[model samples]
Target: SVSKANVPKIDVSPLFGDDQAAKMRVAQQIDAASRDTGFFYAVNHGINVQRLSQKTKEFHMSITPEEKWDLAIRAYNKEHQDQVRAGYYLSIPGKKAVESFCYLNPNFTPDHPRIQAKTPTHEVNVWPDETKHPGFQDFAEQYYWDVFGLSSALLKGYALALGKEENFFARHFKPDDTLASVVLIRYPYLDPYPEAAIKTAADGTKLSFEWHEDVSLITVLYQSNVQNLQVETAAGYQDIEADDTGYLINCGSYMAHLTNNYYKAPIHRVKWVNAERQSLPFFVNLGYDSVIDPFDPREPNGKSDREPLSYGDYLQNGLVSLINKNGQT
Candidate 1:
């Protein structure tokens, strides 16, 4: 049986301090926990979790009933007026998760390096009519930048754990590199219909967001009050909980390949508990051009289980394969 005790918890406030030893100690804990479950919680992370979640909640609640389906107006890139990529994903008949995404580019100005490189991924922050939902744009932008600092620090800590300098991973996330994205998901369930949360698939298997692994370098999950997140283990699935002051962070597939399988990217899913559940997960990709391969301590000369892939193809091609697997057009 997968126990909650197996998913380790550590305090990472030391990572921001000058105490190198304390940071290294936490790194060792992360290394062990990642090898075992690929999931862990960090306490004392010093993030404004409540404000972040509440602002997103406000955004979802502000949508008028008819405006809920007005996805045609939200555009990632204003210049690409004809192209529409899932700014808001409706809870279709088969897929029942009502999720939305907003792109965050730390440096997305017209004169930014990404713009200079002519990269298409540097998207303009998109949103619903700000007049309808006052303060939504301001808070969303604030929360995105706040988590950007947190994500960068965590990546540095992971680099130290993998036997590299703390700043080694910084190369991939420069001024213009498309580094991160955030997803706001709410598994809204009707209160009157208690049994509707659990959906039975055509194969009679219960699914909540389906069984899948993240495709980024790391994922930071913000869970407040709502439950039902589960991760696969050697024995079975274990229910995960977040820290009172911090959040849950997990390694993703690219990090697995970069560490030569020393770190694992485990499969995880959500199961609703007959109530509306909301979560904010930050997917850190480090930028499209970042290339991943095995590190030093691991055998660099032998054949490895992970293919040396760049973040660009991994995000683009891997997305196509995933969509095809779902039989979506």
Candidate 2:
């Protein structure tokens, strides 16, 4: 049986300091947790919890009914598929009960060199009209940076844990050129769903979000204090209780691929709950042009025999697979 003890709580404050020993200590803890469950609670990571929570609520609440339809993923996809790749998305009935707005790093402008080159993941983000959603873009951009900082810190720890220099992964991330994406998700109360309409897993628990592993290198999630999240463990799927003071971190499929399975990417899902919930998950990826080469620490120079894969191609393939799985295509 999985218990709270199985999921470790790691204080990541040390990663921000210059003390190498302290950072190593945290890295060791992360290594253990990553190998054990691929999930951990990151506390003392320097994000203003209260402000993030409040701003998230404010942003979600401020969405007018008309704007929701206007900014729908379907609409955006149809209208802007030629120009950009991502936008607002709402759950398809019988698949999941969530709505989200996904965007890339806000630093990329249309005139940016990468955008001009038509980079695969450097497409302009689709957002609601600024006039209708005042301050939405600013808040979203600020939150992106805040979460990106934490994700970068975690990457350094991951590097050390994997027997590499602390700055080993730094080259893959160029602040303005990264493929990192943020998703603001709102899971509404289950009252609207009919009993027959609800989806259930093999174990017979109803699902709010289907079972899946993230596709990023790492995902930093800030969620409401709702205890509906579950992760598949060796025993079975176990509940992961909400922590208001910290963010939940998880290794994603990309990380597992890059590390040659040294780090696990556990499958997780959200179960049905009666209360409304919100989650902001930042999916951190390498630069679009970066290559996904497997790193085998056991080998000399930490190189693996596997052929390198382009990060952009990998991401495009993953997104298409997800869309097809959700029957969106």
Candidate 3:
């Protein structure tokens, strides 16, 4: 029953109108949309489109499938389960090819050996000079500033959305303090069994990846080539299908708590992995040290917006959900 008209988008028309009144309208829209959609596209944000596009194109052309696969595998090991031959177990299906290691953020850790938090967003991603991807450095340097700028733009709008002063967010996030990452996956298109096939779980004989939610503020997805991601809502298993230029937004547990659940973090998961499905997810989060609390403008002080569940509580609940659903415990 949730319709687009019913859920307002981030209001930025204020920049084009009277400062005081326009900003107020923007605030009203923010409050409503955060409660309803938990995800929506933001416009008038200052991220550069033309430059990011050009640099991204260059980086994409510079990399190869083999290199990506190898990098994923190299990062895997017995204990961490980097890139298992069968597939990675962090998300879903029998096995999925996902690159796990997180890149450091320069904004959060300045003087980073790898630019700390610099996301390869537009930069030509580094593939270990040993991997013969020598062209990565040039493109990454070319694209660094732009991605940083885009992140800055998103940060400003998000801070405003949270009822904070414009510059307050920037203070928490500096050029070297924010951590951002982008993942590019190549899902090979294949015939879906539609018949609903079941696979083995755990013990290296079956599929793994417990059911869970991301713990971030925002995730921007680009062109998911398959229709597998689904959300459990009041209407049953609602498909969280991706649309071109339409970003699928949802709250992680942390975001939900900070907003006092004003922004609901819906449950979602990848159903099958063997099929041909490719997806690109861009993640944005405040620094690791950025603590969260309820929004005062929208919350009353000392009201304890939500029950303070321990970290162990979350882990146990997720394990039970996965075990009950057909995955190994």
Candidate 4:
């Protein structure tokens, strides 16, 4: 019964407008969509649309499929996973998609003092050489924080939507000790685009990427014109369309765990992107030293199965699982 036409799309104009009534209306919509679909399209979400488009094009067109795949596998290898490198990664290759990713913590610099306060050391970004990819470093840093600013508005809006004060979640996120990461993934089109992309997965060994929840509070996705993104709900499967001006906002495991199941972190996947599908996902989290236990007392008592752990350790564990897909620690 559920179809692409029915996928929840909430216009968050009130989150940006001045009307008190308008704000409350959208807040309720956020709660409804989060509960039923776990995913929603946020229109008029106040991001720099033009810059997002330009950067996507620049990164996609410049990098050859050969270079992109090579860099991803290399970084995922154990020898380079913890080498303090800020670069690309591909878990385990299959036919669903050939993708490359570069991770960045835009707010903090490579040697920022705050990066030192964790069990497993926070690695500094080892960006691709500027000579190979001109201005990549600058664009990555600029876009990284630009999206972070948008994330601030979203977290605050979600708080207000939940009937909490606007600063509820915002106040806890330490600006200097941020654990947020902005990751850019480039999925190149194969010779026969669609067919070739999924043939390997059809044989039934693996997928382009496995199904897993993102370990974060909220994930802000800049979905480009390329298609093939889908979301799964209890009702059935639904396709996600491309949007240039809006973002596809979804909750992650951390957000749901914090709320004690009052919210849902919708499961979604990118099956493929015709010629080149570029996705920029900003994983927003609390401060590095912040504990991972429940923050909301009113939600549902101590029902959260999430143990009391530091954000850094939780995140590092995630990275280990991602890169070590080749089966080594």
Pick by TM-score: which candidate is best? 2
Structure candidate 4, residue pairs in collision = 86-126
lDDT at residue 252 of model 2 (Cα atoms): 85
lDDT minimum window of 10 residues, candidate 4? 199-208
Of candidates 3 and 2, the better by TM-score: 2
RMSD of each: 3.8, 2.5, 7.7, 4.3
lDDT by residue (tens digit), candidate 2, 137-165:
88888888888888889889989888878
lDDT to native, each model: 0.68, 0.78, 0.45, 0.64
Ranking the candidates on lDDT from highest down gives 2, 1, 4, 3
> Which has the greatest lDDT?
2
Q: Candidate 4 residues 97-179, lDDT tens each? A: 55445565655554677555433535566665578788877877877777777777777677877667766677766656667
Q: Which ten residues in a row have the lowest lDDT in candidate 1?
A: 71-80
User: Where does model 2 exceed 4 Å of error?
Assistant: 1-5, 75-77, 82-85, 91-96, 298-303, 326-329
Per residue, candidate 3 scores C-alpha lDDT tens digits across 35-146 of 6645555455444434434544444445554544444432243442322111222322334433222232323223553335432221212243534545544544434444
lDDT of 2: 0.78
Candidate 1 Cα outliers beyond 4 Å, as residue runs: 1-5, 72-86, 92-97, 109-122, 192-205, 242-244, 296-307, 326-329
For each candidate, give its TM-score against the true structure. 0.84, 0.91, 0.60, 0.79
lDDT of 2 at 105: 77
In model 1, the Cα lDDT at residue 260 comes to 70
Candidate 3 wrong stretches, greater than 4 Å: 1-24, 43-70, 73-75, 78-148, 168-170, 191-211, 224-228, 271-277, 293-299, 302-329
